Ligand binder design. Sequence first.
Ligand code: HEM
Ligand code: HEM
Ligand code: H4B
Ligand code: H4B
Ligand code: O6I
Ligand code: O6I
Ligand code: ZN
Lengths: 418, 414
Amino acid sequence: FLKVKNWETEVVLTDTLHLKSTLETGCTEYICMGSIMHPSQHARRPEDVATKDQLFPLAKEFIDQYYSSIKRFGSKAHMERLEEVNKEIDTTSTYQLKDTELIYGAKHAWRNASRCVGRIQWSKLQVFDARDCTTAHGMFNYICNHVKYATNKGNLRSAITIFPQRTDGKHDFRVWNSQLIRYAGYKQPDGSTLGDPANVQFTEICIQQGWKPPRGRFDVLPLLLQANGNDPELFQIPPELVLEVPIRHPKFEWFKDLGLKWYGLPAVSNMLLEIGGLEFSACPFSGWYMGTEIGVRDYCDNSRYNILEEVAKKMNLDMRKTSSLWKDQALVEINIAVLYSFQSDKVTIVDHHSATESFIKHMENEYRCRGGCPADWVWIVPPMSGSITPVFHQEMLNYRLTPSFEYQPDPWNTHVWK
Amino acid sequence: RFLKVKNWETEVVLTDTLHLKSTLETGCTEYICMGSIMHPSDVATKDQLFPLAKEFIDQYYSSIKRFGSKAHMERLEEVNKEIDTTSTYQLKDTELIYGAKHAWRNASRCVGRIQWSKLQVFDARDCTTAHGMFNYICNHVKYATNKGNLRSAITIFPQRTDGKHDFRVWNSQLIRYAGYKQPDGSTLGDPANVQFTEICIQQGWKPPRGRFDVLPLLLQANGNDPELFQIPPELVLEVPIRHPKFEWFKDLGLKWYGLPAVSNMLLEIGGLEFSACPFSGWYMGTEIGVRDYCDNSRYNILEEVAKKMNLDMRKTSSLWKDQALVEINIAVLYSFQSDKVTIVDHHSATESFIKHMENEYRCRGGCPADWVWIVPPMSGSITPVFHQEMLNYRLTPSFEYQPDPWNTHVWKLV
Ligand code: HEM
Ligand code: HEM
Ligand SMILES: C[C@H](O)[C@H](O)[C@H]1CNc2nc(N)[nH]c(=O)c2N1
Ligand SMILES: C[C@H](O)[C@H](O)[C@H]1CNc2nc(N)[nH]c(=O)c2N1
Ligand SMILES: Cc1cc(N)nc(CCCCN(C)C)c1
Ligand SMILES: Cc1cc(N)nc(CCCCN(C)C)c1
Ligand SMILES: [Zn+2]
């Protein structure tokens, strides 16, 4: 067993769940890689279509886990399911998840996501089964329905849409966008950047694929959808599906005149969902924002919107030296405005104080019922005001459980066009 | 083998080979990361001490471009003689200085390491009594405080022998404020120091019972019972805290001391253990303004400041805590700068650490760094270290945690 202590409350939790971890963290007894973005390349099956002795053990492990979860280990259905998966692999080199296994797998991938502060909600995930999809047009239909369901007029609901699994790696379904809704970024003639600098490369691909850019600071990017390994196709999300919040400040009347807004729905679409050896390379999932994701990182990273400049100017702060803390002061105001604006418009949002408090409660629940909760301190602690949130003083153990969400290469690095 | 770290702001990529020289354990395994654990976990035998000493001596003669020299080989034989005959050995003055500076250079949790090569080392290995320790510590405080122009320093007392004759400073820092738990459950002074304050009172200290009572030194020499000493008040530089815009901030009656001086850690050099080695630098503002003042378990002044700012404290999403936190840290920095007492803000400190880290990769092949500790406790992502990948590993000479002495000391009075 391993213990974790909270240094504010002195609560000690005892971890045994880590004994079920399967993948390497990247660390060793001599080096810790906890701050590395992608510490490990340890995967569960090789880089493409596995042989039977590579895939079946991963399948059996997950089927065993699912049937244990419902108190039916060794039951009739469990043993038939194993025989069924065996035959499927014998005749197709893969197998197909039942609807129940798919739902279980998706929820537990979220439950196992050690970087996610939002996991107290993990069992409240709506799962849309899109495994019958065959074209990029059908992918667009599924994504539109997902966006409409999840947005729900501002009462946001967590959802995931799961497209057909990888087969031989030449027929991948992929959403090329990193999120379903993101703003364009444009390389300016003088050298600067208009819009979101994170998306300049993706923006140029879209233009390179025929997208006519309106060239503004908040241009919603088109969807770039790839189905069955074919070349990707551009689609415009209907604007009535894209809920946006104008950013205003409860005290500063001039804040409105900054002309800022942001979208309500955070929807990650470039990760990979791994269940029992199966790789779902297109599995867009969405929830609701923690305010700091917009106000600290989107607006105030140097390589992003970088608006600390303007806000501090309008505030008449002394930007002559760092020790006036003008950056910190403007940072707080911007995050006040983001929360005030979303709350005013009745769009679901959580502040980092509430979110981190929820996560401590979630940790305690998971230790009580599951014997552990894998958690990545570097990612869980908010990017501002860390030490005045309870997670700062909370020791955490990070380990990798399956099913899981994984990073995957950007498809433009790997796709050979037609 | 090589390991790469990337900065996701700048895209700079650095190549770590120094990790191959790492020694003891991180706490992590191949399947669990313990990077957010506070401390993941009698005296060395002859056969244990030999290889540790050789590795250090090898390192030292390599750093002075004398590896394999006649002087290198004779030092090794000399060290081997001592261990063989006395079960320990004694460092040369040059080796002690090198070792102390490299323990700082190797401190993966320290953001202030750009200054590592400018450390004043005070050799106190001839000290035999607690009175002598007091004298050494007073001289250290005076030299390091330097009328506000602070200078980094370390004082090194005699090493462990059999573990029954340890030298120890029982204070966690040389200068700290007392904390007194009241019968009604409230705290006067610094809640972090309530327990140590109790021990001092038990030993005979007469407490003023104020909010900023400098604690007395509790000094243990040669394994004897520790003894109390009052630091001369003229040696304790303090800064009253005021705010450049809120004139009411001074009415809070806050102050802090200028000299941060850790006194409860262990310095390991070549297998030798220096259990009493107080070292001092200058503050980063957030150490006082964020943690010392605004930790729930410390002075916890967010509420009063927020009240005087007329903030809406009914809902967390008004971010009144965040707003007060910034204002307190503005006051800390403005106050020290006005009194011309050395301090560094977290933006300046993290920028310099990135410069340091890059230079260490270029000239040394790496820089062990603990991201969890390096990133400041506020405004994390608007500092450059937040976006900087880091590798953590343990190089020696090193500073280490050690048990609190009141948990292991065997008393002898009455
Ligand atoms: C319901 C409200 C949710 C909140 C408030 C939330 C919050 C967050 C935050 C703040 C991060 C840090 C990532 C960053 O800052 O860039 C994160 C990471 C993550 N979240 Fe959640 N999340 C939520 C829902 C979900 C859902 C529904 C899923 C999956 C079904 C999920 C899976 C993940 C994953 C995999 C990561 C890691 C991303 C990476 O490594 O890049 N989250 N979450
Ligand atoms: C010169 C100015 C210095 C600055 C601005 C500085 C800054 C810091 C900061 C902010 C921390 C984090 C600790 C915390 O937040 O509680 C730290 C840790 C540390 N510093 Fe430095 N430091 C300085 C000088 C030194 C010196 C002179 C030494 C040793 C000779 C040293 C050794 C350490 C060690 C060992 C730690 C780790 C302490 C622990 O693990 O609890 N520092 N430093
Ligand atoms: C549990 C957690 O590791 C602990 O609160 C750490 C986090 N990071 C820190 N970072 C610094 N500089 N100082 C600290 O005391 C801590 N505390
Ligand atoms: C290098 C460092 O690990 C990297 O910048 C991480 C730090 N912690 C983070 N935490 C969150 N939530 N999101 C991030 O993108 C990052 N970035
Ligand atoms: C579903 C969800 C909700 C939320 N509030 N945040 C996230 C993380 C977004 C960043 C993920 N990384 C790939 C960049 C996801
Ligand atoms: C020499 C020095 C200077 C400075 N500015 N900070 C420190 C860290 C003290 C923290 C110790 N921890 C156990 C809490 C040391
Ligand atoms: Zn680790």
